[PDB]
Design a protein around this ligand. Structure first.
Ligand code: A1BP6
Ligand code: ZN
Length: 139
Protein backbone atom coordinates (compact mmCIF):
# COMPACT_ATOMS: atom_id res chain seq x y z
CA UNK A 1 0.00 0.00 0.00
CA UNK A 2 0.94 3.68 -0.31
CA UNK A 3 0.21 6.99 -2.00
CA UNK A 4 1.75 10.32 -3.06
CA UNK A 5 0.11 13.47 -1.69
CA UNK A 6 0.94 16.58 -3.75
CA UNK A 7 -1.15 19.76 -3.74
CA UNK A 8 -4.82 18.73 -3.81
CA UNK A 9 -4.05 15.36 -5.42
CA UNK A 10 -3.57 11.77 -4.19
CA UNK A 11 -1.64 9.40 -6.52
CA UNK A 12 -2.24 5.66 -5.98
CA UNK A 13 -1.82 2.37 -7.87
CA UNK A 14 -5.00 2.10 -9.99
CA UNK A 15 -5.53 -1.54 -8.85
CA UNK A 16 -5.55 -0.42 -5.18
CA UNK A 17 -7.81 2.68 -5.63
CA UNK A 18 -10.68 2.87 -3.12
CA UNK A 19 -14.38 3.75 -3.61
CA UNK A 20 -13.49 7.27 -2.43
CA UNK A 21 -10.63 7.57 -4.97
CA UNK A 22 -13.08 6.67 -7.79
CA UNK A 23 -15.73 9.11 -6.47
CA UNK A 24 -13.13 11.94 -6.57
CA UNK A 25 -11.45 10.83 -9.83
CA UNK A 26 -9.19 13.31 -11.69
CA UNK A 27 -7.38 10.93 -14.10
CA UNK A 28 -6.60 7.22 -14.47
CA UNK A 29 -4.68 5.05 -16.90
CA UNK A 30 -4.95 1.24 -16.76
CA UNK A 31 -1.88 0.87 -19.03
CA UNK A 32 0.21 2.73 -16.39
CA UNK A 33 -1.45 1.27 -13.24
CA UNK A 34 -2.06 4.85 -12.02
CA UNK A 35 -5.04 6.75 -10.62
CA UNK A 36 -5.15 10.32 -9.28
CA UNK A 37 -7.99 11.58 -7.04
CA UNK A 38 -8.69 15.01 -5.54
CA UNK A 39 -8.20 15.78 -1.80
CA UNK A 40 -9.51 18.55 0.53
CA UNK A 41 -6.29 18.87 2.57
CA UNK A 42 -2.98 20.08 1.09
CA UNK A 43 -0.41 17.31 0.52
CA UNK A 44 2.94 16.49 2.14
CA UNK A 45 5.07 15.57 -1.08
CA UNK A 46 7.32 17.26 -4.02
CA UNK A 47 7.56 15.62 -7.52
CA UNK A 48 10.98 15.26 -9.16
CA UNK A 49 11.33 16.81 -12.64
CA UNK A 50 14.51 15.17 -13.85
CA UNK A 51 16.13 12.23 -15.65
CA UNK A 52 17.68 10.49 -12.59
CA UNK A 53 18.17 6.71 -12.99
CA UNK A 54 19.26 6.10 -9.34
CA UNK A 55 17.23 6.63 -6.13
CA UNK A 56 15.92 4.97 -3.00
CA UNK A 57 12.60 3.13 -2.55
CA UNK A 58 10.60 1.97 0.45
CA UNK A 59 9.96 -1.80 0.65
CA UNK A 60 7.10 -2.51 3.09
CA UNK A 61 7.76 -6.31 3.13
CA UNK A 62 11.18 -5.58 4.65
CA UNK A 63 10.31 -2.34 6.57
CA UNK A 64 13.43 -0.89 4.86
CA UNK A 65 14.60 1.51 2.18
CA UNK A 66 16.93 0.25 -0.57
CA UNK A 67 19.11 2.11 -3.10
CA UNK A 68 18.41 1.20 -6.77
CA UNK A 69 19.58 1.78 -10.33
CA UNK A 70 16.47 1.74 -12.59
CA UNK A 71 15.71 1.81 -16.30
CA UNK A 72 14.12 4.77 -18.12
CA UNK A 73 10.27 4.72 -18.33
CA UNK A 74 9.30 2.16 -20.99
CA UNK A 75 6.69 -0.29 -22.33
CA UNK A 76 7.19 -3.66 -20.55
CA UNK A 77 5.18 -6.89 -20.72
CA UNK A 78 3.53 -7.74 -17.38
CA UNK A 79 2.07 -11.21 -16.73
CA UNK A 80 -1.64 -11.65 -15.91
CA UNK A 81 -2.66 -11.24 -12.30
CA UNK A 82 -5.99 -11.13 -10.42
CA UNK A 83 -6.05 -7.34 -11.24
CA UNK A 84 -5.16 -7.23 -14.97
CA UNK A 85 -4.99 -9.47 -18.00
CA UNK A 86 -1.50 -10.07 -19.49
CA UNK A 87 -0.59 -6.72 -21.16
CA UNK A 88 2.15 -4.13 -21.84
CA UNK A 89 2.40 -1.62 -19.00
CA UNK A 90 3.69 1.81 -20.10
CA UNK A 91 5.89 4.36 -18.25
CA UNK A 92 7.41 1.50 -16.15
CA UNK A 93 10.94 1.46 -14.78
CA UNK A 94 12.66 -1.74 -13.62
CA UNK A 95 15.35 -2.36 -11.05
CA UNK A 96 16.94 -5.24 -9.18
CA UNK A 97 15.39 -5.39 -5.71
CA UNK A 98 12.84 -7.08 -3.51
CA UNK A 99 9.03 -6.57 -4.15
CA UNK A 100 6.19 -8.90 -3.26
CA UNK A 101 2.34 -8.60 -3.06
CA UNK A 102 1.69 -5.80 -0.70
CA UNK A 103 4.69 -3.64 -1.69
CA UNK A 104 2.79 -1.62 -4.32
CA UNK A 105 2.56 2.04 -3.42
CA UNK A 106 6.03 2.35 -1.86
CA UNK A 107 7.70 5.56 -2.98
CA UNK A 108 10.84 5.82 -5.11
CA UNK A 109 12.71 9.15 -4.51
CA UNK A 110 15.84 10.81 -5.91
CA UNK A 111 17.53 14.02 -4.59
CA UNK A 112 14.90 16.10 -6.52
CA UNK A 113 11.74 14.54 -5.06
CA UNK A 114 9.29 11.72 -5.72
CA UNK A 115 9.99 9.74 -8.93
CA UNK A 116 7.23 7.08 -8.83
CA UNK A 117 5.59 4.22 -6.90
CA UNK A 118 6.12 0.46 -6.76
CA UNK A 119 3.77 -1.23 -9.26
CA UNK A 120 5.31 -4.70 -10.08
CA UNK A 121 7.48 -7.39 -8.42
CA UNK A 122 8.76 -10.94 -8.48
CA UNK A 123 11.84 -12.73 -9.71
CA UNK A 124 14.14 -10.36 -7.74
CA UNK A 125 12.90 -7.37 -9.76
CA UNK A 126 10.93 -4.32 -8.69
CA UNK A 127 9.00 -2.14 -11.17
CA UNK A 128 8.01 1.51 -10.57
CA UNK A 129 5.25 3.49 -12.26
CA UNK A 130 6.87 6.87 -13.21
CA UNK A 131 5.04 10.10 -12.29
CA UNK A 132 7.69 12.68 -13.44
CA UNK A 133 5.94 13.36 -16.73
CA UNK A 134 2.66 14.41 -15.01
CA UNK A 135 3.45 18.14 -14.89
CA UNK A 136 -0.12 19.10 -13.98
CA UNK A 137 0.33 17.50 -10.50
CA UNK A 138 2.28 20.75 -9.59
CA UNK A 139 -0.53 23.16 -10.54
C1 A1BP6 B 1 1.13 -11.67 -8.94
O1 A1BP6 B 1 1.72 -10.47 -8.43
C2 A1BP6 B 1 2.97 -10.56 -7.89
C3 A1BP6 B 1 3.67 -11.77 -7.74
C4 A1BP6 B 1 4.93 -11.76 -7.18
C5 A1BP6 B 1 5.49 -10.58 -6.74
C6 A1BP6 B 1 4.78 -9.39 -6.85
C7 A1BP6 B 1 3.53 -9.35 -7.45
C8 A1BP6 B 1 2.75 -8.05 -7.63
C9 A1BP6 B 1 3.41 -6.85 -6.92
C10 A1BP6 B 1 2.66 -7.73 -9.12
O2 A1BP6 B 1 3.67 -7.67 -9.80
N1 A1BP6 B 1 1.44 -7.42 -9.64
C11 A1BP6 B 1 0.12 -7.62 -9.02
C12 A1BP6 B 1 -0.68 -6.31 -8.93
C13 A1BP6 B 1 -0.74 -5.60 -10.28
C14 A1BP6 B 1 0.67 -5.46 -10.89
C15 A1BP6 B 1 0.64 -4.72 -12.21
N2 A1BP6 B 1 1.19 -3.50 -12.23
O3 A1BP6 B 1 0.12 -5.22 -13.21
C16 A1BP6 B 1 1.36 -6.82 -10.98
ZN1 ZN C 1 16.17 13.37 -9.78
Amino acid sequence: SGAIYVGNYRVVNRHLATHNDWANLVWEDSSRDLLVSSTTAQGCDTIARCDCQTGVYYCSSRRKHYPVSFSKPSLIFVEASEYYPARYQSHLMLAVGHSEPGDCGGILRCQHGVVGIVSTGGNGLVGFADVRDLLWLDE
